Design a protein around this nucleic acid. Structure first.
Ligand SMILES: [Mg+2]
Ligand SMILES: [Mg+2]
Ligand SMILES: [Mg+2]
Ligand SMILES: [Mg+2]
Ligand SMILES: [Mg+2]
Ligand SMILES: [Mg+2]
Ligand SMILES: [Mg+2]
Ligand SMILES: [Mg+2]
Ligand SMILES: [Mg+2]
Ligand SMILES: [Mg+2]
Lengths: 90, 199, 67, 80
RNA sequence: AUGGAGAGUUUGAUCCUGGCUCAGGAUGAACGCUGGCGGCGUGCCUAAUACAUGCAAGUCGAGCGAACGGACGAGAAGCUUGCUUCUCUGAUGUUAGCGGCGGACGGGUGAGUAACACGUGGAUAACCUACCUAUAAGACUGGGAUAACUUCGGGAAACCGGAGCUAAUACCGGAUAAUAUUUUGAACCGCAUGGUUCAAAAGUGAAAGACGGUCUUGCUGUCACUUAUAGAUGGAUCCGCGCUGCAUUAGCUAGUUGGUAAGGUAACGGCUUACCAAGGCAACGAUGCAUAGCCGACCUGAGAGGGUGAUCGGCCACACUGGAACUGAGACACGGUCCAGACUCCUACGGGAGGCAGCAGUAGGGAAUCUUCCGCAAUGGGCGAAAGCCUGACGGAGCAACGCCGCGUGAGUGAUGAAGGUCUUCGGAUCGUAAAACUCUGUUAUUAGGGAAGAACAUAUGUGUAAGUAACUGUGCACAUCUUGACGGUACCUAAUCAGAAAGCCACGGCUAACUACGUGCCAGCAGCCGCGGUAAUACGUAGGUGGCAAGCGUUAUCCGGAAUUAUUGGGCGUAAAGCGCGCGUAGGCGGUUUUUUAAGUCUGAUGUGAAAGCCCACGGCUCAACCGUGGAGGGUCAUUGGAAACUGGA
């Protein structure tokens, strides 16, 4: 189905990722529905994470499902709690 | 370095002392080789443009590819192209080290940077082509503080340009600001070089 | 040629080893003196030997470095 | 509701049954020279009552495919 | 204002016209000579030729029967209490088969396609959509089989046939349940057809369990199941406009154009079929022929333009050739099926087997294009509750100066201008501060130690919290803990030793930077053009010297430039190429003055959109750069909507 996942960029031995909403059948570095953020694993010994809460929450509401690393990111940024809180509150 | 040929022959051909002292031009101020002593026919307009370009290139000991790339990036900046090219040439770690006076020769300064003796902002920079920007501090590696070459060069109180600020006690220089055309070599007519690269 | 077109190719350099049934590499370039010759034989490629004793512009005539 | 495209043209054929052919004239600027050149397209249109006649200005709106070639219907007759 | 160079060659000389040629940039390049390293890329363009071999798609025991394995541990003493059997229990496990899901993705290629294929902008009151999310309502009551298995039989084989037996979240009946279907009331609404909403009947349509918790003659957690309605996603159709050469291709079409009715499709529709009519298309290029995947982009150019469509991303098409359907949410399906054909292979001659335009690799073709590698550690995908398994996707490694960028092959001092080579006016001059000598350095190299990031996790294990419950287990969420790296002991770092191992290529008459000697003598040869060479060649070949570049330098091929030589920007037609021999005129192009009006062109805004990557600009990260990342800017002949009205158009 619809998935929030990391698309690989950068160069050899220098990964950079864009956090994107994509259909699963889509190729990893191919067609996407929307980009929500970025993730840099190799940056300054601290993962650098940019995410749009408004976009991430809209997609999580509509049934988009994170890959495991993306879930960790949305947890680190606090989006996964917000999703739960609203959903329980609903 | 990269070009490792006779610096005198190159000076004599180009009618300019690459060492900046005139030692090459003192005895034989004419082109090298068999026909050097004989009269030289007048240079064409292309000949003059090429001569001026080669003068600047051999002065900074750069290869043509790199020289042309530097000319391009200089052109992309704001202001007068020729002047921007010359200040950008002067901003090379090579040139900065030489002008600070950590070496007595440009080739020596290049070997110093290339062999990893030099520090920029406390960290090792080994690329002679490195483009030093204003505010950066050039230093000597802690191990190399007592090199005979460096100490002797610094002892010889070479004039340090105004855009730099050297402390001989600490062997630490500072790239204070961008050079000015006044501070840059006066024997170069950069306009000819711009014209050369136009055609 | 391999495309089956018959052409006249110039043989450059001083001296050649080529005979009928030799296999050769042909490049572009016409000889102005010779009317029908619109191609050159490449020296030092396939059967064609390099010019012997060529010591200047050897790459053009397929000669290895003398040393 | 989203709006379907509407065109105005002159009826050039009324021979077919419940159908009129409408010639819509537009200008295509030349890519290089920049002069506008008159261009015409005949649009096959549905005229249920066979109301329109050759030489009458008509207003046509886009529809679902009504035939092999017919994609438009007659909204009104502007002039006769 | 950021951006624009010319030169040679028609003559005795000249000005002009005019073609030809060159200096530049670019490449998936190839070839010749030569060759140190690193980073980041790129690498069958030709035969959509044929393909040996391994691998590229599985997974699920928490759907199911069955089989294997049989722990822990049951009995007798062979007097061997360490070895024994079936008279048992039989745990963690494992698998062939059934069933579910996946296999329609990912990966490859560009043959076909001149087309709504694609690009851009719209439409669907003519559509469809597994998994995912949300909400609501349910999951009741029965049945008959069949793999595996057992046995028999037929085949060379591939693989079939009979009998018997057996499960399921397999299959089937009935019940109950629709906004679905029919019919009848309304109400409101749009853009023809029509949309929407609310009532009253009629016919008709579902489902399923598994693994756990508990207070266990009954509740419940998670997952699975069914129906209805939305969302999300993906797909389908239609249309405006844009998108290719040839008229020495001018006519083309009969399901053809339209209508009617019926059938058919998710769906509109000649989509199809009967019937009726004669339409439809075309000089605004139909039809035919040739060629071609299209685009984002890419190369060049001051620009306007011109050329191109590798790598990467999007869309399309194809899967030995041709046809067809089946299964399914989705295929008319690269590693599915059936048939025909060609080819290859096996055979007991009866009959069988197969499809690298997946990754490697081979043969062939070609000027020319890589290893039959490592790992699922990362990212992504399938299956599973999950661990996990599968993954030639992908991450890495290998090979190749193929490209781009970076750094080397030493540095300082050095007249005593040594020797030697070359030239010479025999004075000398040049190679040449070059060398040697002396001093110094270690990029690199070599050797020896240290040694990253990339890793997030998932799971499991605690604690808390939220919803729900009688409560619990679970579930979501939050915070802790252990553990996981192919590359790889790689990058990088440190120390020690050593100038030692690390420069070639083309050119030097002019364009065009750089000349002499000797040999040769219209020969041998050179050559992009002007040309050069027939005895004192800066043009041949070699040598010395020089010039231009540099791990490259040259050559060839091809594209843009210069070429204002198709000229919109930006040329011409008396004599240079060029005014139809001349009328009458059709289409078309163009058109006097004023006022009023309109607003199609024009001008000025707003809104949506013109993917990402790229180009450009800025900033940040890699020791620098290349490269990587991020944010802007730009790119329409775009659509929609609001103004202005001089000019063009309309009235
Ligand atoms: Mg083709
Ligand atoms: Mg131009
Ligand atoms: Mg398949
Ligand atoms: Mg296959
Ligand atoms: Mg280089
Ligand atoms: Mg030659
Ligand atoms: Mg032109
Ligand atoms: Mg004439
Ligand atoms: Mg006349
Ligand atoms: Mg973009």
């Amino acid at each position: 189905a619809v998935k929030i996942r990391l698309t690989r960029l950068g160069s050899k031995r220098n990964p950079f990722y864009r956090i994107v909403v994509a259909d699963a059948r889509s190729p990893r570095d191919g067609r996407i529905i929307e980009q929500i953020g970025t993730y840099n694993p190799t940056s300054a010994n601290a993962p650098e994470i940019k995410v749009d809460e408004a976009l991430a929450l809209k997609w999580l509401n509509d049934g988009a499902k994170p890959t495991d690393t993306v879930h960790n990111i949305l947890s680190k940024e606090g989006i996964m709690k917000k999703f739960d809180e609203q959903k329980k509150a609903k | 370095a990269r070009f490792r040929g006779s610096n005198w022959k190159k000076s004599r051909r180009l009618g300019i002392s690459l060492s900046g002292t005139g030692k090459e031009l003192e005895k034989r101020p004419y082109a090298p080789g068999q026909h050097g002593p004989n009269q030289r026919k007048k240079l064409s307009e292309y000949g003059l443009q090429l001569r001026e370009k080669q003068k600047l290139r051999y002065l900074y000991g750069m290869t043509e590819r790199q020289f042309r790339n530097t000319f391009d990036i200089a052109g992309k900046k704001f202001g007068v192209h020729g002047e921007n090219f010359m200040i950008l040439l002067a901003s090379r770690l090579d040139a900065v080290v030489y002008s600070l006076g950590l070496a007595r020769t440009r080739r020596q300064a290049r070997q110093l940077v290339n062999h990893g003796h030099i520090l920029v902002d406390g960290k090792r920079v080994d690329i002679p082509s490195y483009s030093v920007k204003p505010g950066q501090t050039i230093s000597v590696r802690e191990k190399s503080q007592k090199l005979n070459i460096i100490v002797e060069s610094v002892e010889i109180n070479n004039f340090v340009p105004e855009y730099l600020n050297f402390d001989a006690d600490s062997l630490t220089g500072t790239f204070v600001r961008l050079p000015e055309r006044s501070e840059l070599p006066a024997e170069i007519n950069e306009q000819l070089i711009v014209e050369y690269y136009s055609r | 040629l391999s495309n089956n077109i018959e052409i006249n190719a110039y043989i450059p350099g001083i001296g050649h080893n080529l005979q009928e049934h030799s296999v050769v590499l042909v490049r572009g370039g016409r000889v102005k003196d010779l009317p029908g010759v619109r191609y050159h034989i490449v020296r030092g490629a396939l059967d064609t030997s390099g010019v012997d004793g060529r010591r200047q512009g050897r790459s053009l005539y397929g000669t290895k470095k003398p040393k | 509701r989203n709006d379907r495209k509407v065109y105005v043209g002159k009826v050039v054929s009324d021979k077919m049954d419940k159908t009129i052919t409408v010639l819509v004239e537009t200008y295509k600027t030349h890519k290089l020279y920049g002069k506008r050149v008159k261009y015409s397209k005949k649009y096959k249109t549905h005229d249920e009552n066979n109301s329109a006649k050759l030489g009458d200005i008509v207003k046509i709106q886009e529809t679902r495919p009504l035939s092999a070639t017919k994609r438009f219907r007659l909204v009104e007759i502007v002039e006769e």
